[PDB]
Design a protein around this ligand. Structure first.
Ligand SMILES: [Mg+2]
Length: 189
């Protein structure tokens, strides 16, 4: 069971449990905000907004680390953070139809783990119009069968999410600015 999740997602909370995630520096406020949005009853899917290379994915890894560390509110305790693996979804698929079938499987598995998994979808706009899985994502989001964190640029969010109420009512912008040079080089060992 949950074959789609094992095949097409990367368990970031597991990577944290294994000590494989780099410490995340200078993002206390963005991680806290991401958590606050996720905890909402409605419009509870945060979308990290920023230019490429600003480190949005690191914020998601930071969220995973905090959960493992228990540095999160009570209801988020024991939650799993899974990143949609686009490379894996496309590997050996060849056709859009096969890709869609695999994505559908992922959503089905998530509908069974409602409230236990947070899915991270990088470059979210590419899944809703920028290969449009909007039809399956919209009801999943509305029914709480999909609780996720997305990442895009402001212009991409405006063009593909903000103009579509079925999507916009479910997402919340969380801005991410470029990190300081100091914090960027701090990751080196
Ligand atoms: Mg980035």
């Amino acid at each position: 069971h949950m074959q789609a999740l094992k095949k097409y997602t990367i368990d970031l909370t597991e990577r944290a449990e294994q000590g494989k995630l780099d410490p995340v520096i200078g993002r206390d406020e963005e991680i806290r905000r991401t958590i606050q949005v996720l905890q909402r009853r409605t419009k509870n899917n945060p979308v990290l907004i920023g230019e490429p290379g600003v480190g949005k994915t690191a914020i998601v890894e930071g969220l995973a680390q905090r959960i493992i560390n228990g540095e999160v509110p009570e209801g988020l305790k024991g939650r799993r953070v899974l990143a949609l693996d686009m490379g894996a979804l496309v590997a050996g698929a060849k056709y859009r139809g096969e890709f869609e079938e695999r994505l559908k499987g992922v959503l089905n598995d998530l509908a069974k783990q409602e409230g236990n998994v947070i899915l991270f979808i990088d470059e979210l706009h590419t899944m809703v119009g920028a290969m449009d899985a909007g039809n399956m994502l919209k009801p999943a989001l509305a029914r709480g069968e999909l609780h996720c964190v997305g990442a895009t640029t402001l212009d991409e969010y405006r063009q593909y999410i903000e103009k579509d109420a079925a999507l916009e009512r479910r997402f919340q912008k969380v801005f991410v600015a470029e990190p300081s040079v100091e914090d960027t080089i701090a990751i080196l060992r």
